[PDB]
Every structure is written in C-alpha cells, then in structure tokens.
Amino acid sequence: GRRLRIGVPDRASFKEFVSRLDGSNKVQGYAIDVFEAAVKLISYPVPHEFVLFGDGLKNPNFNEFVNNVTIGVFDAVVGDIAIVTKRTRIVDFTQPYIESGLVVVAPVGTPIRGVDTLISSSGRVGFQVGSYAENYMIDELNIARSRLVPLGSPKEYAAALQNGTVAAIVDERPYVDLFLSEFCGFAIRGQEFTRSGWGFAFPRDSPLAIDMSTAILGLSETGQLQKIHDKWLSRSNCSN
Numbered sequence: 464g465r466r467l468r469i470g471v472p473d474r475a476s477f478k479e480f481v482s483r484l485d486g487s488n489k490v491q492g493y494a495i496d497v498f499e500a501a502v503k504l505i506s507y508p509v510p511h512e513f514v515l516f517g518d519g520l521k522n523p524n525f526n527e528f529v530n531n532v533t534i535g536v537f538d539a540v541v542g543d544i545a546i547v548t549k550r551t552r553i554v555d556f557t558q559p560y561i562e563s564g565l566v567v568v569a570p571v572g573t574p575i576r577g578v579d580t581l582i583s584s585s586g587r588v589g590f591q592v593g594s595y596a597e598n599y600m601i602d603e604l605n606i607a608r609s610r611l612v613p614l615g616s617p618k619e620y621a622a623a624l625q626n627g628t629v630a631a632i633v634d635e636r637p638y639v640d641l642f643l644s645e646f647c648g649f650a651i652r653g654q655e656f657t658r659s660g661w662g663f664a665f666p667r668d669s670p671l672a673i674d675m676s677t678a679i680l681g682l683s684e685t686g687q688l689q690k691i692h693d694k695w696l697s698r699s700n701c702s703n
C-alpha cells in the first residue's frame with residue numbers, strides 16, 4: 464500500500480510528451496495523461512508519486528532512466544519510453560500505448576532516400592540526445608560514431624539541417640512529427656526502420672505491467688487514448 468516512486472523524464476524539449484509543469488515538482492503531458500487515465504481502470508489502488516529524472520539541461524538518457532527501475536531507485540517509469548529489446552531484458556513494459564519507430568528526416572529535395580542512403584554515405588547524422596537511436600546506429604547499423612551529432616530540440620534540428628552541419632537526422636516518428644509541425648522545409652525519407660512503440664516500465668515479473676496493458680487497451684477501445692493524443696499532439700503549421 465506504499466506510494467510507488469514513478470520516474471518521469473525531465474524533458475528539455477518536445478515537452479508535449481511529458482515535462483515538469485512551470486518549473487514546479489509537478490508534471491504534465493501526453494504520457495502523464497495516458498498513465499493517469501489507465502490507473503483509473505486498474506481494479507486496485509496504485510498510490511504513486513512522480514520523481515523527475517534528468518539534469519534539467521538536456522533530455523535524459525532513456526537507457527539510464529529505465530535502469531533506475533532495475534536498481535530500485537524507481538518502482539516504475541512513465542514517459543515516452545521506447546520498448547527496445549535490450550530494455551525488455553531488465554524491466555517489464557506494458558503493451559505500447561503509441562506506435563513509434565526510427566525514421567530519417569532531411570531537407571526537402573535531399574537525395575537521401577532512407578537509412579540505407581545514410582549507411583552507404585559519409586555525411587554527418589543528427590540524433591536526439593539520450594535516444595536509443597544513438598546506440599542503434601552505432602551497434603546495429605555500424606554507422607561510424609564520428610558521424611553522429613547530438614541535438615537537443617526541434618529548433619536545433621532545423622538549424623543543423625539548414626546549415627549542413629548534418630545531412631539528416633534519425634529519430635523516432637513522434638518527435639519528427641512534432642518537428643515537421645513546427646519547422647517547414649523538411650521531410651521524412653523512407654519508412655520506419657524500427658517498430659518499438661512507447662510503454663511504461665515496471666520491474667521484471669511485475670503484475671502491474673500486465674494489468675496496465677489491459678487498462679491501456681481499455682483506453683484504446685473507448686477512444687480515450689486517441690482523445691489524449693488529440694489534446695497534446697495535433698497542432699501543425701505545415702502542409703507539404
């Protein structure tokens with residue numbers, strides 16, 4: 464019956480997903496709304512307190528964040544957390560509450576067609592600081608570490624692409640959709656080349672990971688999950 468210590472990423476950018484409210488110790492955003500809606504559908508109480516994770520200067524390392532459940536600093540983590548295979552070895556995720564996977568974004572009229580263009584070329588590649596994309600590109604795709612440039616925010620994405628400091632950026636589709644809604648002149652090249660959605664994570668063998676999956680499914684089936692997306696993530700200033 465004790466309050467679960469739930470870690471939440473202290474996002475410096477793309478704060479619509481989850482962030483600190485107005486520099487308080489309170490939190491808000493898309494993932495928080497999904498979690499609180501889901502908890503209402505759980506058949507037993509889930510007392511909890513949210514605990515911000517990160518330096519407040521840059522988006523946190525999501526691998527390190529999830530590891531804080533494994534080592535017991537957090538009882539759970541709630542946020543925009545990609546369900547990637549290495550993390551599933553050390554926590555139990557819910558079923559995903561939103562689709563996500565890595566895509567390539569570049570200037571309109573780029574010759575880049577997708578991640579296979581990057582693998583066979585020399586240009587620098589941007590990624591979001593703290594994203595699994597960094598490890599994915601180095602490890603799975605064997606892209607030279609020297610080519611990778613960490614970027615902090617959608618303004619930095621537009622600047623790096625415009626000034627040619629990177630040829631393209633690799634990041635998960637939800638961040639790229641928010642970027643393309645704010646900054647005109649860029650486009651996704653190719654399909655997703657990973658398919659890990661976002662989920663909440665609990666300790667290995669936690670019953671709450673399974674109970675929360677049924678609750679998330681309930682939200683999907685009633686249309687509440689779509690309405691929460693609409694609340695946080697539907698604004699766009701871009702056609703093309």
Ligand code: NA
Nearest residue numbers: 616617618619
């Ligand atoms: Na920005």
